[PDB]
Amino acid sequence: MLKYIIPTIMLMPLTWLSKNNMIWVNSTAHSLLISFTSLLLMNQFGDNSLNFSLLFFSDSLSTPLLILTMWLLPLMLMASQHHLSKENLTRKKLFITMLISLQLFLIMTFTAMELILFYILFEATLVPTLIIITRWGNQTERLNAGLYFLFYTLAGSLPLLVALIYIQNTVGSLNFLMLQYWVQPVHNSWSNVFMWLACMMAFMVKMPLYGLHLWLPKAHVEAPIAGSMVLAAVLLKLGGYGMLRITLILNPMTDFMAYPFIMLSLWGMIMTSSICLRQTDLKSLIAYSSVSHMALVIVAILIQTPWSYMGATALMIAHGLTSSMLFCLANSNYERIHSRTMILARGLQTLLPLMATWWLLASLTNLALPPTINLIGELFVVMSTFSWSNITIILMGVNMVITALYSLYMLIMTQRGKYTYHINNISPSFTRENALMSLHILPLLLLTLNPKIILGPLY
Amino acid sequence: GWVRPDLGDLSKVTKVKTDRPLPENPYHSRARPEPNPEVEGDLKPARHGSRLFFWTM
Numbered sequence: 034m035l036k037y038i039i040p041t042i043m044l045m046p047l048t049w050l051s052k053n054n055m056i057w058v059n060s061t062a063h064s065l066l067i068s069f070t071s072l073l074l075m076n077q078f079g080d081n082s083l084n085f086s087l088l089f090f091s092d093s094l095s096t097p098l099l100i101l102t103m104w105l106l107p108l109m110l111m112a113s114q115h116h117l118s119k120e121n122l123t124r125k126k127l128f129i130t131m132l133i134s135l136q137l138f139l140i141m142t143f144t145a146m147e148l149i150l151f152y153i154l155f156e157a158t159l160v161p162t163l164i165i166i167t168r169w170g171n172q173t174e175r176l177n178a179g180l181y182f183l184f185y186t187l188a189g190s191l192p193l194l195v196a197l198i199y200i201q202n203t204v205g206s207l208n209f210l211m212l213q214y215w216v217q218p219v220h221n222s223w224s225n226v227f228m229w230l231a232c233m234m235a236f237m238v239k240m241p242l243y244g245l246h247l248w249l250p251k252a253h254v255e256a257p258i259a260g261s262m263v264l265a266a267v268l269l270k271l272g273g274y275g276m277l278r279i280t281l282i283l284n285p286m287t288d289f290m291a292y293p294f295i296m297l298s299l300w301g302m303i304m305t306s307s308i309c310l311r312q313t314d315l316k317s318l319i320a321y322s323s324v325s326h327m328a329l330v331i332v333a334i335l336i337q338t339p340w341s342y343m344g345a346t347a348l349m350i351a352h353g354l355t356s357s358m359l360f361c362l363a364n365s366n367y368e369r370i371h372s373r374t375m376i377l378a379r380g381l382q383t384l385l386p387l388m389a390t391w392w393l394l395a396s397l398t399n400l401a402l403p404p405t406i407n408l409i410g411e412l413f414v415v416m417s418t419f420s421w422s423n424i425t426i427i428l429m430g431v432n433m434v435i436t437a438l439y440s441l442y443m444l445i446m447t448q449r450g451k452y453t454y455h456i457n458n459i460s461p462s463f464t465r466e467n468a469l470m471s472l473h474i475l476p477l478l479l480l481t482l483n484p485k486i487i488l489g490p491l492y
Numbered sequence: 493g494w495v496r497p498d499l500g501d502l503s504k505v506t507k508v509k510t511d512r513p514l515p516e517n518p519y520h521s522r523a524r525p526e527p528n529p530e531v532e533g534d535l536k537p538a539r540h541g542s543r544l545f546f547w548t549m
């Protein structure tokens with residue numbers, strides 16, 4: 034992984050040593066080159082994972098998450114450089130540095146062989162994320178959002194640290210390959226119940242699990258646009274990636290310990306989907322949409338079937354591109370009208386025709402139109418959950434109806450009807466904005482041609 | 493015929509002939525506890541390093 038870690042680190046001197054007026058050009062160009070080389074991680078084998086060294090490895094689960102991560106950095110630089118245009122040079126460079134450091138921690142997080150190396154980098158991502166939210170967020174609420182983000186994550190992750198060290202003392206190793214062969218079944222005792230919760234709650238909070246999600250509508254809404262993109266696209270998926278890994282050592286206890294969290298997710302997805310119908314803040318609506326989608330990933334991971342694991346991997350990738358696109362679309366309106374209220378600016382299809390096409394495509398992927406990879410992931414999860422219990426099709430079916438309703442409600446409210454008379458500063462869409470949207474949707478639809486590369490290790 | 497000893501004479505350490513055998517265990521000591529086994533041999537580098545969590549050295 035050093036062929037990706039070292040180039041990522043070099044983005045920092047590149048940013049600091051660049052000419053003042055070339056910081057965005059230079060960092061964007063070279064971050065795209067790194068993203069291009071990440072395609073070499075697609076050398077996956079049917080039986081064995083691609084094991085680089087004692088520290089790092091990549092299998093079909095981490096590889097797509099790595100490619101998404103490295104793809105997101107140039108998109109975030111494009112999304113940020115407009116609203117940071119009046120920031121002074123040194124603070125711009127520090128903003129880019131936080132983004133680079135977050136990428137460094139993420140790519141090492143997804144390839145860490147040892148769960149305690151995974152833990153340190155998994156917590157490490159908090160620091161740059163907190164700084165981005167609180168320093169460069171726009172509203173007073175960013176300070177409160179940072180505290181909710183920080184202490185929800187740590188309340189869960191500190192018990193995880195105790196559990197992981199306990200496992201290493203008992204097994205002798207936290208190396209993930211070793212745990213595949215030395216894993217022992219978990220006896221059903223009270224002490225193992227709390228080991229199970231310690232190993233899972235930190236990941237549940239990051240998903241987020243319904244009930245433990247209050248940090249997300251604060252953090253995702255108060256962050257700057259780059260903060261929201263990475264928060265929704267990648268950082269929510271650390272929880273899914275962590276759960277997909279750690280459930281290996283929790284069988285068979287997951288059979289019954291899953292029930293309370295499956296109920297929270299199956300009912301929670303309907304609750305959060307309903308909330309979207311009455312949200313007044315466009316960014317807040319998009320944030321609650323993420324909670325509903327990640328409820329499917331939680332359920333898929335907990336029922337532990339080959340189909341649910343393929344579906345979960347696809348959804349995580351599909352949601353990452355879609356939710357990031359929606360935040361970027363919402364941000365482009367915000368940079369014009371300087372409000373997040375959804376009813377403020379209406380009929381934007383009349384004033385911004387091409388941008389209204391991006392809204393439509395973003396909405397259709399969000400409601401999982403076939404054959405998008407959003408639908409492929411959702412379908413595979415619904416199939417596996419039907420086998421877990423036929424009755425689940427009712428909750429899955431209702432959620433798909435509600436999801437269509439709020440996805441198109443967002444489209445209709447903002448893009449259709451009559452334009453707001455007094456809003457007269459809706460200038461034409463910039464080339465930058467149009468390129469930013471198409472760099473989300475084009476890869477998303479291309480993956481429909483070759484879905485296997487985002488179906489994970491069970492494929 | 494008695495001659496008074498000179499200054500310093502009576503404070504000399506002298507040697508005495510005796511048939512009483514030298515006591516073997518005048519303190520009546522128990523047998524001493526056995527020392528712990530010595531650690532011996534050549535010092536070799538630690539196997540795979542510190543072995544602390546993920547560190548490879």
Ligand SMILES: CCCCCCCCCCCCCCCCCC(=O)OC[C@H](COP(=O)(O)OCCN)OC(=O)CCCCCCCCCCCCCCCCC
Nearest residue numbers: 177180181182184185186187188189190192234235238245
């Ligand atoms: C294992 C599973 C985990 C998953 C479940 C996690 C559940 C969620 C946990 C939430 C933690 C608490 C809430 C954190 C959100 C941020 C708190 C906050 O912002 O409250 C604001 C409140 C107002 O006061 P203040 O902000 O100071 O006024 C302005 C001056 N700055 O500020 C205050 O009044 C002071 C707030 C102090 C609390 C700080 C947070 C500490 C949390 C750990 C509690 C420690 C408990 C130890 C007690 C042991 C003995 C019983």
Ligand SMILES: CCCCCCCCCCCCCCCCCC(=O)OC[C@H](COP(=O)(O)OCCN)OC(=O)CCCCCCCCCCCCCCCCC
Nearest residue numbers: 221222223226230243244245288289290292293294296297
């Ligand atoms: C809103 C806050 C958000 C945070 C949420 C935090 C969730 C934490 C949940 C922790 C609960 C963990 C369970 C601890 C109880 C002990 C578990 C246990 O060991 O019981 C074993 C037994 C298994 O039963 P059985 O399947 O029959 O055994 C195998 C034979 N077939 O036990 C069983 O019968 C299995 C059933 C256990 C689950 C009970 C479910 C209760 C009803 C659903 C509640 C949903 C969650 C409610 C959260 C509200 C919080 C205010």
